């Protein structure tokens, strides 16, 4: 009892983190409002560009902690690109955020903090380019509800 009605063509992908991934960022596509079609591969948590052209890259990550153990905490989130022409990981988009400004329950309790980070830009990618979205602290991820963490590309 299945069919399809619209064609569509642009190579596209919008993958969301695995909720049953207790301590890691595993990208999934077999979920309701997620897409991965028209040739795009996902090799070892990495998006493989299927054709040379102009792509739009976006990703969001949400960090949550139930208390600040030590001021020295850095939340980082960067999207990388390894091309066939230059076989080294280079950052295309990056952002850093400090969730805890001193404090560290000196006069408070477990104060749940939430910090989101969004990344986006347009790039020219060639065939076989491997894009990867990564974060430094995979233990502060909050994927418990819905579309709070994701990563995707679309050929314009």
């Amino acid at each position: 009892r299945s069919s399809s009605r619209t064609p569509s063509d642009k190579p596209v992908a919008h993958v969301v983190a695995n909720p049953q991934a207790e301590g890691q960022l595993q990208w999934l596509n077999r979920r309701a409002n997620a897409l991965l079609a028209n040739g795009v591969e996902l090799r070892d948590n990495q998006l493989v560009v299927p054709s040379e052209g102009l792509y739009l890259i976006y990703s969001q990550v949400l960090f949550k902690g139930q208390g600040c153990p030590s001021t020295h905490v850095l939340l980082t989130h960067t999207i990388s690109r390894i091309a066939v022409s230059y076989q080294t990981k280079v950052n295309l988009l990056s952002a850093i955020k400090s969730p805890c400004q001193r404090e560290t329950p000196e006069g408070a309790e477990a104060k749940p903090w939430y910090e989101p980070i969004y990344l986006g830009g347009v790039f020219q990618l060639e065939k076989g380019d491997r894009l990867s979205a990564e974060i430094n602290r995979p233990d502060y991820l909050d994927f418990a509800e819905s579309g709070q963490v994701y990563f995707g590309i679309i050929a314009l």
Partner: protein, 112 residues
């Protein structure tokens, strides 16, 4: 690492010849449109090295490497020399850089 200068710290004597090699890592940059820039020790303005006379250039497109041999070395030509290349594939045009410093000591003048 998108262009690699081999001799980072060099120490030659007045009257010698240092060779600086740069190797291309991006297969989009071409060994034909290469440029060199020096910054004289103690000054901030970066000057552009000219092709002629003391500056002889060896380019090999097969290995995608270019060099710059500097002859008749003086003690006032000590500074940070960088190499450059022009890259262009699709809609993109960019340039790449390196780094490498030279220090020259003098030889005095035997006063009998």
């Amino acid at each position: 690492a998108r262009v690699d200068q081999t001799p980072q710290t060099i120490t030659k004597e007045t009257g010698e010849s240092l060779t600086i090699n740069c190797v291309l890592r991006d297969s989009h940059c071409a060994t034909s449109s290469t440029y060199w820039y020096r910054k004289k020790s103690g000054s901030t303005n970066e000057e552009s090295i000219s092709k002629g006379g003391r500056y002889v250039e060896t380019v090999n497109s097969g290995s995608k490497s270019f060099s710059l041999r500097i002859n008749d070395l003086t003690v006032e030509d000590s500074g940070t020399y960088r190499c450059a290349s022009e890259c262009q594939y699709g809609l993109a045009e960019y340039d790449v850089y390196g780094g490498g410093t030279v220090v020259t000591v003098n030889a005095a003048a035997h006063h009998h």
